[PDB]
Swiss-Prot record, chain A:
Effect of I127V: In EBFP2.0; shifts the excitation and emission spectra to shorter wavelengths and increases quantum yields compared to BFP
Phenotypic consequence of A205V: In EBFP1.2; shifts the excitation and emission spectra to shorter wavelengths and increases quantum yields compared to BFP
Official protein name in the record: Green fluorescent protein
GO biological process: one example: generation of precursor metabolites and energy
Taxonomic source organism: Aequorea victoria
Post-translational modifications reported in the UniProt record: Contains a chromophore consisting of modified amino acid residues. Maturation of the chromophore requires nothing other than molecular oxygen.
Amino acid sequence: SMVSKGEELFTGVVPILVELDGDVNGHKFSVSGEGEGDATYGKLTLKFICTTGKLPVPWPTLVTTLVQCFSRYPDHMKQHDFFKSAMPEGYVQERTIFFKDDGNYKTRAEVKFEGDTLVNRIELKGIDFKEDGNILGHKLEYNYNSHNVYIMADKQKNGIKVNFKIRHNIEDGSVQLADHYQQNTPIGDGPVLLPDNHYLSTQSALSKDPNEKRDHMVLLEFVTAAGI
Amino acid sequence: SDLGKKLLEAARAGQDDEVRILMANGADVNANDVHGSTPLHLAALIGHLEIVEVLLKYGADVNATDIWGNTPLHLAARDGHLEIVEVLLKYGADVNADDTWGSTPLHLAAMDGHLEIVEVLLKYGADVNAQDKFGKTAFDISIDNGNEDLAEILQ
Ligand SMILES: [Br-]
């Protein structure tokens, strides 16, 4: 029913660009990604490349870091889509991700429109990772589970928060938890509707391009909102 | 393909005249993108009935499935496109197709509150006792959402 200024920008297929500057236990790296999203369908099609050489962490550990404005919201919930309604000037997304029995990532990102393209620019810092362990030791399977996340208004900070657990599969049948603590704030300074609490449901498929020499990840996703 | 990519885009963009041009110049009606989305998925998604019909006439697979388990009927039911639901069913859509979460078109239509679509799905043999993988039937969903009108016809 409602169509905000920012929602108008997602009626079609939208080109995406992702740039990430990373540092984990002192290992510098960069990732760039390209593709598109279709928020009416609820899909993402992205390819990411490590431009520095070999990725010092598993690709699956980066998926949550590397644009929830491409979620499909039902008609009756359009007024609750903070992410699209923050556009074009966009939002800051901040996370701390704790890998159990291992180190942590801290991320700061800006998601906004630059011309006609939706751009996610990320800074990432990792620390206290065991050289032995599942991350630096690259013992994660190259796959990804379906996860629901509970989106919560945070009045005091004029944004939203999300606290969720990702289960990463390990080679030998076990699982590595990553506890995500997420905070999102508009970049604009105007009045803003904070959403009622609801859920995003994400499905993800990871693959490789047959013709790509560089360390890369092809990521397809399908995302829908529910729970109002 | 190539002519296939042009067709996927024109379908999604709702450019009806372009679609007709591509079709008569021999474009692959069953082209798909990397998600397995076909032009028929895309025209059903946006609710372009004339395009849905053209594509069916030229041999579109009514039961093409994306990698997420969505058929065009899933997308039409979810988005509330009644005449498109009707035509897909008439021309052989599987009314009880399950996506990845075990959701049939009846589940999606119930979740989004689309009464007339639910009535038509039931007419075509939609299973009121089919459970998704949270163990929910469409009826259970309508009760969760507090929808008297759906609950009454889904019981
Ligand atoms: Br488009």
